[PDB]
Motif scaffolding. Structure first.
Motif, mmCIF file in Angstrom:
data_model
loop_
_atom_site.group_PDB
_atom_site.id
_atom_site.type_symbol
_atom_site.label_atom_id
_atom_site.label_comp_id
_atom_site.label_asym_id
_atom_site.label_seq_id
_atom_site.Cartn_x
_atom_site.Cartn_y
_atom_site.Cartn_z
ATOM 1 N N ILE B 188 -8.240 -5.785 4.027
ATOM 2 C CA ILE B 188 -6.825 -5.478 4.417
ATOM 3 C C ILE B 188 -5.753 -5.942 3.430
ATOM 4 O O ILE B 188 -4.699 -5.183 3.131
ATOM 5 C CB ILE B 188 -6.529 -5.790 5.914
ATOM 6 C CG1 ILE B 188 -5.310 -5.024 6.313
ATOM 7 C CG2 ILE B 188 -6.030 -7.419 6.112
ATOM 8 C CD1 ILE B 188 -4.933 -5.173 7.783
ATOM 9 N N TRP B 189 -5.893 -7.046 2.845
ATOM 10 C CA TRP B 189 -4.968 -7.571 1.692
ATOM 11 C C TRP B 189 -4.765 -6.166 0.432
ATOM 12 O O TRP B 189 -3.356 -6.237 0.110
ATOM 13 C CB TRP B 189 -5.584 -8.388 0.989
ATOM 14 C CG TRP B 189 -5.607 -9.514 1.930
ATOM 15 C CD1 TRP B 189 -6.814 -10.376 2.466
ATOM 16 C CD2 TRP B 189 -4.579 -10.553 2.698
ATOM 17 N NE1 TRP B 189 -6.472 -11.318 3.298
ATOM 18 C CE2 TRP B 189 -5.118 -11.374 3.311
ATOM 19 C CE3 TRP B 189 -2.939 -10.371 2.485
ATOM 20 C CZ2 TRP B 189 -4.439 -12.269 4.345
ATOM 21 C CZ3 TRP B 189 -2.366 -11.213 3.233
ATOM 22 C CH2 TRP B 189 -2.852 -12.031 4.346
ATOM 23 N N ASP B 190 -5.835 -5.453 0.481
ATOM 24 C CA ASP B 190 -5.476 -4.443 -0.467
ATOM 25 C C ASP B 190 -4.168 -3.352 -0.097
ATOM 26 O O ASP B 190 -3.746 -2.952 -0.915
ATOM 27 C CB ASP B 190 -6.732 -3.354 -0.479
ATOM 28 C CG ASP B 190 -7.921 -4.001 -1.383
ATOM 29 O OD1 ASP B 190 -7.830 -5.136 -1.795
ATOM 30 O OD2 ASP B 190 -8.910 -3.503 -1.305
ATOM 31 N N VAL B 191 -3.925 -3.303 1.050
ATOM 32 C CA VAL B 191 -2.863 -2.455 1.724
ATOM 33 C C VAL B 191 -1.677 -3.362 2.388
ATOM 34 O O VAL B 191 -0.658 -2.688 2.927
ATOM 35 C CB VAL B 191 -3.488 -1.503 2.663
ATOM 36 C CG1 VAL B 191 -4.355 -0.398 2.077
ATOM 37 C CG2 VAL B 191 -3.965 -2.210 3.783
ATOM 38 N N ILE B 192 -1.539 -4.512 2.249
ATOM 39 C CA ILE B 192 -0.362 -5.443 2.571
ATOM 40 C C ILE B 192 0.837 -5.089 1.548
ATOM 41 O O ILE B 192 0.656 -5.106 0.139
ATOM 42 C CB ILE B 192 -0.590 -6.819 2.647
ATOM 43 C CG1 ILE B 192 -1.606 -7.098 3.719
ATOM 44 C CG2 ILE B 192 0.523 -7.644 2.782
ATOM 45 C CD1 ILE B 192 -1.375 -6.648 5.109
ATOM 46 N N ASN B 193 1.862 -4.481 2.266
ATOM 47 C CA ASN B 193 3.086 -4.374 1.699
ATOM 48 C C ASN B 193 3.842 -5.701 1.515
ATOM 49 O O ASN B 193 4.625 -6.094 2.437
ATOM 50 C CB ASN B 193 3.984 -3.314 2.454
ATOM 51 C CG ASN B 193 5.218 -3.053 1.698
ATOM 52 O OD1 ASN B 193 5.474 -3.444 0.470
ATOM 53 N ND2 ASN B 193 5.875 -1.896 2.099
ATOM 54 N N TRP B 194 3.706 -6.451 0.223
ATOM 55 C CA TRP B 194 4.471 -7.523 0.034
ATOM 56 C C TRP B 194 5.919 -7.514 -0.062
ATOM 57 O O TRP B 194 6.686 -8.422 -0.124
ATOM 58 C CB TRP B 194 3.924 -8.513 -1.169
ATOM 59 C CG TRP B 194 2.556 -8.866 -1.035
ATOM 60 C CD1 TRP B 194 1.288 -8.401 -1.055
ATOM 61 C CD2 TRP B 194 2.306 -9.963 0.092
ATOM 62 N NE1 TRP B 194 0.356 -9.050 -0.695
ATOM 63 C CE2 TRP B 194 0.717 -10.082 0.211
ATOM 64 C CE3 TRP B 194 2.878 -10.848 0.863
ATOM 65 C CZ2 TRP B 194 0.176 -11.037 0.805
ATOM 66 C CZ3 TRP B 194 2.239 -11.968 1.486
ATOM 67 C CH2 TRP B 194 0.867 -11.868 1.670
ATOM 68 N N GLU B 195 6.433 -6.357 -0.339
ATOM 69 C CA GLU B 195 7.880 -5.891 -0.556
ATOM 70 C C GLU B 195 8.464 -6.037 0.757
ATOM 71 O O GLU B 195 9.656 -6.380 0.918
ATOM 72 C CB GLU B 195 8.117 -4.570 -1.240
ATOM 73 C CG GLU B 195 7.457 -4.628 -2.660
ATOM 74 C CD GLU B 195 7.708 -3.463 -3.497
ATOM 75 O OE1 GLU B 195 7.444 -3.349 -4.524
ATOM 76 O OE2 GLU B 195 8.171 -2.337 -2.873
ATOM 77 N N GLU B 196 7.717 -5.534 1.742
ATOM 78 C CA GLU B 196 8.287 -5.655 3.214
ATOM 79 C C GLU B 196 8.190 -7.115 3.681
ATOM 80 O O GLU B 196 9.086 -7.696 4.390
ATOM 81 C CB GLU B 196 7.521 -4.647 4.141
ATOM 82 C CG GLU B 196 7.928 -4.720 5.521
ATOM 83 C CD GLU B 196 9.306 -4.365 5.898
ATOM 84 O OE1 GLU B 196 10.075 -3.610 5.080
ATOM 85 O OE2 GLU B 196 9.813 -4.481 7.006
#
Ligand SMILES: [Mn+2]
Ligand SMILES: [Mn+2]
Lengths: 206, 206
Positions: B188-196
């Motif tokens: 799931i880390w591949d799709v975490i939005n760190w900007e949000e």
């Protein structure tokens, strides 16, 4: 290894035998991964404790004395072992005369019982189990529990001997039914082994 | 209908946008069935109660005063709404400088933080969520909660403002991963939005 304290009973049917209600892939993963993990983790959790040589019933009856690992894996093992025993590929089983009479007097009919179990299963928020138990008055009762907790555990409010349990963890139904837990509950009755439920009822009353 | 208290936000991406980690069928059922139901049942549960005109954060902050239907669906709605916002098909997002500094001082590195969240997620027995929160002293913490409970609830042990939540209910991962929750968490880390996540962090510190 014959010396482990707890083992999974051999399944009396093939993984694809229950396709009237439960897909083969689920049967295989549910038995060989989820349930096998509860058994192995139970053996580890009890090792070196006063639970180490106790029966599963006695561990549950005193479960609050032990770690959370004992609780969760004792529940898991007990519940799944019971669950496999109350499924069958053979259509058309029915309650014994004595169980039928008790169901009718307590709920009205077999349909009315199924409706109550279905409703309890639907109402269980999150992971858990629906149960038909025999209370300490010899009376039938429908309940549900969270996670792997069950009606034999010391702290459970509605206590009694389980004669039927239906798994409502999402792993039990998601591959075939996804969010449609109510359709799973409706359909599973086609594979419930009422001869086993009846034998459990006979023992609970003794 | 503009007058309902709570509404779902449509996904800001296609259902199949996250197929690096999460299947399209799951995204569709998860958003249109599970999360839609929490929103609908939330609006019903608070109607004609003091929660009726309260913001979601205020409902949660007093949630012990309301029914289980309010608690479970307020949590469900909040948690899913946050969840969709912290996923993205845009690869290679990274924490803001401020968030990265706080992560590194608190956990050591981004990988260390991921490890900690993966461990909390794995140790959540039954249904629930893993969280990264900003506590009331401005510090980052990793936690998990049961069912739809969350760190804004008045009876949660480790309180704070969530900046990232990962759903570990089986419905979130069973179609693609089955029992392999740990593989889901790794991927799931591949799709975490760190900007949000970083925007939520900045707001939480105010
Ligand atoms: Mn199960
Ligand atoms: Mn979910």
């Amino acid at each position: 290894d014959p010396f482990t304290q707890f083992k999974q009973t051999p399944l009396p049917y093939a993984y694809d035998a229950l396709e009237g209600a439960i897909d083969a892939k689920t049967m295989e993963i549910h038995h060989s991964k989820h349930a096998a993990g509860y058994t192995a983790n139970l053996n580890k959790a009890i090792a070196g404790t006063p639970a180490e040589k106790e029966s599963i019933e006695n561990i549950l009856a005193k479960v609050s004395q032990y770690s959370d690992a004992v609780r969760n894996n004792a529940g898991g093992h007990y519940n799944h072992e019971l669950f496999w025993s109350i499924l069958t590929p053979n259509k058309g089983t029915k309650p014994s005369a004595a169980l039928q009479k008790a169901i009718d007097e307590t709920f009205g009919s077999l349909d009315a019982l199924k409706e109550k179990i279905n409703a309890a299963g639907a109402a269980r928020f999150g992971s858990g189990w629906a149960w038909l138990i025999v209370d300490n008055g010899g009376k039938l009762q429908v309940t549900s529990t969270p996670n792997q907790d069950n009606p034999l555990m010391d702290f459970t409010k509605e206590k009694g001997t389980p004669i039927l349990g239906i798994d409502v963890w999402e792993h039990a139904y998601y591959l075939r039914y996804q969010n449609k837990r109510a359709d799973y509950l409706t359909t599973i009755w086609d594979v419930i082994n009422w001869e086993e439920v009846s034998a459990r009822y006979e023992k609970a009353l003794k």
